[PDB]
């Protein structure tokens, strides 16, 4: 059955239990941004450090 309107779904859905795993790559670790940050000293190019 549809969850928003309670109507039946014309097709029949294939459902069953399976075994999933959670990989190591999470999103809290891959987001980063720079906007006028620290720069180097000799060549004055943007630096992270």
């Amino acid at each position: 059955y549809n969850g928003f309107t309670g109507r039946k779904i014309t097709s029949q859905i294939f459902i069953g239990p399976t075994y999933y795993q959670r990989l190591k790559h999470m999103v809290d670790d891959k987001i980063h941004s720079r906007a006028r940050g620290p720069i180097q000293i000799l060549n004055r190019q943007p630096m992270e450090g």
Binding site: P38, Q40, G49
Partner: protein, 250 residues
């Protein structure tokens, strides 16, 4: 500290852009000025360079930690720099630096031990030692028996209780000065002997003498000096394997 409107009173720096900000105004006086991280050729010390390899060979032959060695390296460097004692054998100075560092770490090793790892006579090491004390103008510390209770008893694989009993026996003996004029080790070994003789882990004086390096008669003499108080010198927390009355005489 400065600003065009006022002489600055305080200039904080920021982890963000990396710059110097001035809170009485917010003005970024500095602008990303701060960095946010806040052989054959050798002639000099060809012999000094080799001496520290030889320090590293000799110092850790007994497996002394690197922190001790690093100051030994720093000590020599200092002794080298003054060069007042420059006209002397390097290996003696290295060995003397080594004796000092152990004392500086509060864990001296006997010259006898230091001799084991070097060719230098105890006399020349002592001589050089004095010169370094005078050279570097620094004081030293007196020896304690307990500092050698650990490894010797270890070398005999004696249990801590015997080891600790010996230490008290030694400690009580020195507080009472039962053995005036004597080196700490000879007195300690006899205490260890007495202790070992107060446990099942008895050993012959010659074996102990062999481990400490002292003469078997010197222990025998030192024993004669501590024997009058053998019973009372023991710690209150002890379990005899042999009555003090049954303690042997020599």
């Amino acid at each position: 500290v400065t600003c065009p409107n006022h002489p600055d009173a305080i200039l904080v720096e920021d982890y963000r852009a990396g710059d110097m900000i001035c809170p009485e105004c917010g003005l970024v006086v500095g602008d990303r000025v701060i960095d946010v991280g806040s052989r054959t050729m050798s002639s000099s010390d060809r012999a000094m360079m080799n001496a520290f390899k030889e320090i590293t060979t000799m110092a850790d032959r007994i497996n002394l930690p690197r922190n001790i060695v690093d100051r030994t390296n720093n000590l020599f460097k200092q002794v080298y720099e003054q060069k007042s004692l420059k006209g002397r054998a390097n290996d003696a100075i290295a060995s003397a630096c080594l004796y000092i560092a152990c004392r500086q770490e509060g864990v001296p090793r006997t010259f006898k031990e230091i001799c084991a790892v070097s060719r230098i006579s105890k006399k020349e090491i002592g001589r050089c030692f004095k010169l370094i004390l005078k050279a570097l103008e620094t004081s030293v510390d007196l020896i304690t028996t307990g500092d050698f209770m650990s490894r010797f008893c270890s070398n005999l694989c004696l249990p801590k209780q015997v080891q600790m009993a010996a230490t008290h026996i030694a400690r009580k003996a020195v507080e009472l000065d039962l053995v005036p004029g004597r080196s700490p080790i000879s007195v300690a070994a006899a205490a260890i002997y007495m202790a070992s003789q107060a446990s099942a882990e008895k050993r012959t004086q010659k074996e102990i003498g062999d481990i400490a390096g002292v003469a078997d008669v010197t222990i025998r003499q030192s024993y004669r000096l501590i024997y009058p108080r053998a019973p009372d010198l023991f710690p209150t927390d002890f379990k005899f394997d042999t009555p003090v009355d049954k303690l042997p005489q020599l």
